[PDB]
Each structure stands twice: as structure tokens, then as C-alpha cells.
């Protein structure tokens, strides 16, 4: 039982076309069949190194609980095309977060099935049992409204939105580049 | 600016006249063998100032400095552009799929 938003599979093909040589991650905050509200990324290319990885968290467990949001899910999408098996580094991380909340579940963007409008929801959920990470099953339905969903993130893409987008390891570079990207949120509102 | 440039080329072209004049005036020694073995002073101080002139925009042409200490352009290198090594490229990624093969 894992629910995101379409914002948040607009994000996710954001970020994945923002840098896609690169392998990614992120996370998803939620209010407290969880409901990810809203979603946040960070870094890109090497993501095996720990101290971003924890500074990160830090800081997306102090935004979301000054504003009353917590984090309940971890995003990463692979480099190679023939890749759709969670890192070590996935795995990790996933299972520190869901220490937390045991409806924090870990989500894959499978770069196989990544296209222009696409087509088949890229994204795969794992959850966590028998001590055990495995994927749900694919046939489940994951975005709210798929069709909005496809044509939101068709627009966006064709919309050169993003190399606008700013994830976090931009605000790293320069904080004058707003890491919470509110400006992705109000494309989505007026394109909806 | 550019407008340096153009400045020392009508030095050279002051020079240049200088020289004219004091070809004539060689001339004028040449046809009056007098003793004068002097130049005007309006040529000297006409050659004088177009070396002036001439030397001051020579010196902006010349270029502009580099500063010494390594740090100085590698400031603004950011991870995401050392990272990338370009003779190691791969082209197994998402971009491909994604975009219109
Ligand atoms: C710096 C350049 C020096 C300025 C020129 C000064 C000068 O020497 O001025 C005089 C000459 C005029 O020589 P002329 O043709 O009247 O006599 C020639 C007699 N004949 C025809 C029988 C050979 O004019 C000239 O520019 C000289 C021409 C050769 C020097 C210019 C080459 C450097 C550029």
C-alpha cells in the first residue's frame, strides 16, 4: 500500500531527465495506503558516499517537521539501462528511513520503460518483509491520475522545464538555487 | 576596449608623418648647408607625443594579467563537471531510451 502524487511522478521524470548519465535519488515526505504528498532530490553521478547522504536526511527531517510533513519514502534511479535491482547503497538507506515508519517503502525509477510521454508507470515500488526487500506487484496501479500524470509530464518535458529544475545538490553548489523548487509546484498547479 | 586598438594605429600613423617631416626637413639641410644641425621643435615634440600616445595604448594592448595562485579559476569548478571524464564515456543510460532513438 504505497500512494504517490502525480507531482510526485512529474519530479520523479524531472530529475531523471535533469541528469540522465547520471544515477539519482531523493525522497518523498508525507503527512502523518500512506499519501506521498509532496517530494524532494538530492545529488547525482556518485551516490555511494555517506556525509551528503546524512546532511541530506538532517536537512529533510528539519523542513518537514518545521512544516509539519515527514519523510516517509526513498527515491533512486540507476545509471545503466539493464539495471532494475536495488544498490547497496538503496538498500541502506531505505532501511534506515523505514526504522522510522513501517509504511516507508522503497520506489525504483526504471529507466527501461522511460520515455517521452510515458507510456507504462516507470516507477517500481519494493517493500520490506521477512527482513527481506521485493517488488510489489507491477500490474497495481501507483499514480493518482495517470492521465494527468502523462500529459503534466509530457508538457513539462517539451516545456525544457528541466534544466530549470534545482535538486539538492544544486542548492550545494549555490543556495541562491532554492532547493525546495517551488517553481516546478506552480507549473503544476497552472498546468492543472 | 576595443576603441585601444584603433588609438595605437594613429600613433603609428603619427609616427609615421613624423617621419615625413623629418625626411623634408633632412632636405631643407640638404639645400641650405647652413649651420642649423638642429630639428624643428614642432617635430620633435610631435614624435614625442605619438610615442607617448602610442606606448600608453601599446601597454592596454599588450593584454591583461593572470593571477598566479592555482585556485583562482578552478573556483568556480563544480563537482558536476570533473566528474564526468570524458574518454570513459557510457551510453547505457536513460537519456537514449528516453529521448527520440
Ligand atoms: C618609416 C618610413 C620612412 C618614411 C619615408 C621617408 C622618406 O624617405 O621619404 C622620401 C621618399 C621620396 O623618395 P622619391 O621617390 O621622391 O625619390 C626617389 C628617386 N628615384 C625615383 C630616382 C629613385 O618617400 C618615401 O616614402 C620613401 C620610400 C621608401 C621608404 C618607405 C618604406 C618604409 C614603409
Redesign the pocket.
Given at each position: 500500500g504505497v500512494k504517490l502524487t502525480t507531482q510526485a511522478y512529474c519530479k520523479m521524470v524531472l530529475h531523471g531527465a535533469k541528469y540522465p548519465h547520471c544515477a539519482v535519488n531523493g525522497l518523498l515526505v508525507a503527512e502523518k495506503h500512506t499519501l506521498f504528498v509532496d517530494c524532494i532530490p538530492l545529488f547525482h553521478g556518485t551516490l555511494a558516499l555517506a556525509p551528503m547522504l546524512e546532511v541530506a536526511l538532517t536537512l529533510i527531517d528539519s523542513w518537514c517537521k518545521d512544516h509539519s510533513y515527514v519523510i516517509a519514502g526513498y527515491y533512486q534511479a540507476n545509471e545503466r539501462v539493464k539495471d532494475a535491482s536495488p544498490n547497496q547503497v538503496a538498500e541502506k538507506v531505505a532501511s534506515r528511513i523505514a526504522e522510522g515508519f513501517s509504511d516507508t517503502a522503497l520506489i525504483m525509477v526504471d529507466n527501461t520503460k522511460f520515455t517521452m510521454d510515458c507510456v507504462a508507470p516507470t516507477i517500481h515500488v519494493y517493500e520490506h518483509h521477512e527482513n527481506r526487500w521485493r517488488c510489489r506487484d507491477p500490474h497495481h496501479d501507483y499514480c493518482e491520475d495517470w492521465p494527468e500524470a502523462q500529459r503534466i509530464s509530457a508538457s513539462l518535458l517539451d516545456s525544457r522545464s528541466y534544466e530549470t529544475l534545482v535538486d539538492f545538490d544544486n542548492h550545494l553548489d549555490d543556495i541562491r538555487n532554492d532547493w525546495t523548487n517551488p517553481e516546478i509546484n506552480k507549473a503544476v498547479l497552472h498546468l492543472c | 576596449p576595443s576603441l585601444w586598438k584603433g588609438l595605437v594605429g594613429i600613433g603609428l600613423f603619427a609616427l609615421?608623418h613624423a617621419?615625413?617631416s623629418?625626411?623634408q626637413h633632412r632636405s631643407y639641410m640638404r639645400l641650405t648647408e647652413k649651420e642649423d644641425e638642429s630639428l624643428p621643435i614642432d617635430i620633435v615634440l610631435q614624435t614625442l607625443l605619438a610615442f607617448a600616445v602610442t606606448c600608453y595604448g601599446i601597454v592596454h594592448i599588450a593584454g591583461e594579467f593572470k593571477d598566479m595562485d592555482a585556485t583562482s579559476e578552478l573556483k568556480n569548478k563544480t563537482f558536476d563537471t570533473l566528474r564526468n571524464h570524458p574518454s570513459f564515456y557510457v551510453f547505457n543510460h536513460r537519456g537514449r531510451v528516453l529521448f527520440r532513438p
Open positions: - | 609615421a617621419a615625413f623629418a625626411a
